[PDB]
Amino acid sequence: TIRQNYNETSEAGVNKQINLELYASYTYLSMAFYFDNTTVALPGAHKYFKKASDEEREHAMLLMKFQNQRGGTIVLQDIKKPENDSWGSLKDAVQAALALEKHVNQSLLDLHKLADSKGDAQMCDWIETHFLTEQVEAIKELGDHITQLTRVGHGLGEYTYDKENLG
Amino acid sequence: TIRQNYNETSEAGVNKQINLELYASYTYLSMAFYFDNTTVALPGAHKYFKKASDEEREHAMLLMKFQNQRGGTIVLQDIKKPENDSWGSLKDAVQAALALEKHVNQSLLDLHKLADSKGDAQMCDWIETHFLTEQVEAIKELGDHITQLTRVGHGLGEYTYDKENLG
Amino acid sequence: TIRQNYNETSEAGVNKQINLELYASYTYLSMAFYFDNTTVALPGAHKYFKKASDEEREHAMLLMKFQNQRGGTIVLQDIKKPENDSWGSLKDAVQAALALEKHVNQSLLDLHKLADSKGDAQMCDWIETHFLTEQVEAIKELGDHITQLTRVGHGLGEYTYDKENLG
Amino acid sequence: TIRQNYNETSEAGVNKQINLELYASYTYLSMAFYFDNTTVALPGAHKYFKKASDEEREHAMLLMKFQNQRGGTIVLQDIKKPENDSWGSLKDAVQAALALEKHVNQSLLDLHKLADSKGDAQMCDWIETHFLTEQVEAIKELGDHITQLTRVGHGLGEYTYDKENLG
Amino acid sequence: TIRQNYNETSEAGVNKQINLELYASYTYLSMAFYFDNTTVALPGAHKYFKKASDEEREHAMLLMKFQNQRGGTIVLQDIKKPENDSWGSLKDAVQAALALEKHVNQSLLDLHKLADSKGDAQMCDWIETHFLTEQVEAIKELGDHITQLTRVGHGLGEYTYDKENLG
Amino acid sequence: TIRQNYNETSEAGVNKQINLELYASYTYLSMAFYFDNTTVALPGAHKYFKKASDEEREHAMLLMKFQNQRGGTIVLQDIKKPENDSWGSLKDAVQAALALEKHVNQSLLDLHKLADSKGDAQMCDWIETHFLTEQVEAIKELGDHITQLTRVGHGLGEYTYDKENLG
Amino acid sequence: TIRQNYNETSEAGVNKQINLELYASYTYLSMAFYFDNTTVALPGAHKYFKKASDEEREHAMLLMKFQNQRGGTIVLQDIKKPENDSWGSLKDAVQAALALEKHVNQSLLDLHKLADSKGDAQMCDWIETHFLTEQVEAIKELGDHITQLTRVGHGLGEYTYDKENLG
């Protein structure tokens, strides 16, 4: 028995975060291949969101590793399809990514608060180490992208930012 | 308009195959982290199924790329959770992998047959090039693993094969 | 006598594809030096279409090699001059290239269907191997160029796409 | 059970091809050492036919591998001795090699047709990938050798072609 | 005329040895691909017997070379199919290889004795140089393999010896 | 006293062989400088026979070394001048070389037989090791040269073979 | 059972040669450390005979390997102490080594004759390959050493030959 100081509600919270990270990965994968569609044809955004999909899947596997490390049991659920089939302009998609990352951030903060309420000092630090600052940096990056995409405007500016910044 | 000689039924079969490859990726991910659970503790199998999960996800993205190349539209669905939460012995899991890969193979053969019935010569060759021989090779490899896992037996043999062959 | 399983109608189809590939090469050569004219002065497009002209001539020589390999006889015809003397905007020329490549694709698919109706298994696979996927990729690329050229607009955007993408 | 979409008549056809490839290997071995006989003494042809014998044995082993990959059973038969004990002039031998490769080509085309009639998409593609174009190229090469051997004539020409081309 | 001190019964004996070496090569090929069958799945034995098949074919070609060197005439016969279609356990197969190599050894000793009775000093030395010690060493190696296969036992031991020693 | 199991008749046969190897060396030297005469002017043959002369002289010194190793006494005789002053065509000379090498071979076989009749096991193996297979190989090479020189014919062929093969 | 064409008297002869080679090794070891004694102090001879002792032990192990290779049974006997405790002058010791090597040579020739009388063609060639010429060369070398040691004389010459030749 390796389980120690690991509450069953914390364990359920981890399984729930695993699903949410997979959901984000699937959403960024949808975004990536939307921008690869010939009627959209923004290759920098295709690369940017494909990499984001890879990273979210890595986040899910980190949480699965943690579940096993602490002596919990991974329980998987359906990965719901993304909210949209097509994602509009480049700015629209980055705005949707900002909304999603803020939703993931709030879910991570609630998980941290739950672990903390149960005295799980190692879990709290683990969440801080691998997730909380990474989320803050991703959110700041997405916000900057939105401000710049507003600045460059439609048409030539969207092509330029796609190629020079996202790609 | 880039679409040419690409039938709407073939397009729907590609969207179906995308979902099935993702379902396989999720099943192998479940298997991989089952073998990482401390009550199982087979590290070679963890590595082997994690890599299979990566590959199936790559198969899904190849089909997504093909959907776009031919002028179709990707439509994603929920990725159903895997059939089991735990996978038994190493041989049980390899047997479950074999059954899944044969299900995937029949789905690909059916997709090929449909494309062929619509005169889609490029789609048929594409499926042959990227999937049909790869599937034959994976099934032969899984069959051989099952025969060897029967030969080495329970206990020390399972440890040895996990470490010396799968890992 | 090396000729085996090679129908006289297949042979005539190959001679006809040889002429069409040469016609495409001549058309891209016209496009390339139109963009080199001082009243147009788009050097990226000059390079892009010069390379496309080289590749179409390579396609014709592949078919001539195949004709000889199967024991047919090459019969050449006049290479008709291109449909236009000047090609308009950059987007107009890429649209004309998309139309031409789709016409070449349909001609290749008809050639494949003819060979298949005569049981010429090697010819069908040869056409798949060297032409059918290459055509699909060229058509997707041209479509993406058109979507991007629409996005960047007239003037500065056409200069930019010419230099940063086509060149 | 790995066997899937693999018809028993296809399996018997593969076993027949294995014997024919081994028969071809044995014939080229006979040719090779005929040319090593001191009353013949053509060292370039010795090397050329010895290599052809090696390759035909590789073809046999590819088909044995394929038989196992698809879940069939290899059944071997006698390898019949070659049709002749001595092979005449260099041109005579290359002419006999051409006749044999066309016989093997027809056998491969009949095997492909049989597989296609049973809907074995992977087998057809495997035969195309490993044998059909390979066979077209070998027949063209043998045809060209016969034309050149006719051109160079008896005596000095035969010595020269043996040394400068076959060797 | 290069023939010197080369008896016609020696020449017929060399032709007989050529067929026996080719028969041995064919038997080891059968063994090799029996072990590649998915119901057997012993990859080390596949590689070990494939190499033995190559070497026996080299032995055949050495004797063909010798026949030509001495001014004899090579006369080939059918290569009879191997005695079995399947070869049992790894130990069974190595035991059958030992029986075959002892049969080949006795044939070589009878060939040496025949040559010696005709005063063919060079032939006797050639057989000693290329075959007799080579054969003693192969028999000793096969004997040691059988003893070790008995020692390691069924199951895990067979897997281990196949992988660590034969492979 | 080092002499052991070395019969006086074997010793006299070694002294006889020493003289015959020297006679061969002198014959090939004559041939070599015949082909260097300006009325013949075949430089490849000059090089080829000069090297054969060097080798035969090395054979004589090996036998001299062996005479001393076994405790015999070297006794030298006149080296008789070669049978001819001029050697005709390139084929004539190679034919004369073949006859001489077969005479040398019979002399070596007779020497082996004598040693064997005296129980000199080491001398027999020594003759086998240094001479009997070397002689078989030289005779086969000379036979092949004669066959090729017949194939290439007079004039241009003789020039070509001299330069491309002998030189 | 690996034993084939290996007579029980041959086997007994091999066991007997094993003992004789060990006896020679022990004798050269005695010689080597005699010359290392401070009242003798010939360091070149110490090295020379130490190496000879190593080689004779290697000869014994070759014969033990051969016994096992042919399926005999090694049976060891006492290694008798050397005939002398001290070996006189340097020339006296080399004379004793010559006598011993001639005794070993005669024993090897008798072993060869016995094997030959039983038709053991491989054994005869093995003895020739590893022993008979090596013995002839060692005997010639020892004889030369004795002639030179006579030439250089007592005192300074013995010191010089010891250092410049044996060491």
Residue numbers in the entry:
A (entry chain B), B (entry chain H), C (entry chain B), D (entry chain A), E (entry chain A), F (entry chain H), ...: 3 to 169
Question: What does the study report here?
Answer:
Ferritin is the main iron storage protein in most living organisms, playing a key role in iron homeostasis and detoxification. Canonical ferritin is composed of 24 subunits, which self-assemble into a quasi-spherical nanocage with an outer diameter of ~12 nm and an interior diameter of ~8 nm. Ferritin has prominent octahedral 4-3-2 symmetry, and each ferritin molecule contains 24 C3–C4 interfaces, 12 C2 interfaces, 8 C3 interfaces, and 6 C4 interfaces, which provide several potential pathways for metal ions and small organic molecules to diffuse into its inner cavity.
Upon analysis of the crystal structure of AfFer, we deemed Pro156 an ideal position for anchoring the His motif, because the side chain of Pro156 located on the exterior of the C4 interface that protrudes on the outside surface of the protein cage. Subsequently, Pro156 was replaced with His, termed P156HAfFer. Upon screening the solution conditions, similar platelet-like crystals were formed with P156HAfFer at the low concentration (2.0 µM), which is six-fold lower than that required for the growth of above crystals, in a solution containing 10–20% alcohol and 200 mM MgCl2 at pH 8.0, suggestive of a self-assembly process. To elucidate the protein assembly behavior at the atomic level, we obtained P156HAfFer flaky crystals and solved its crystal structure at a 2.10 Å resolution. As expected, the P156HAfFer nanocages were arranged in a BCT fashion in the crystals. The designed His motifs of P156HAfFer form four pairs of π–π stacking forces in a face-to-face configuration along at the C4 interfaces, whereas the inherent Pro156 residues in native AfFer stabilize the BCT arrangement through weak van der Waals forces. Collectively, these findings demonstrate that P156HAfFer nanocages have the ability to self-assemble into a BCT lattice in both solution and crystals through the designed His-mediated π–π stacking interactions at the C4 interfaces.
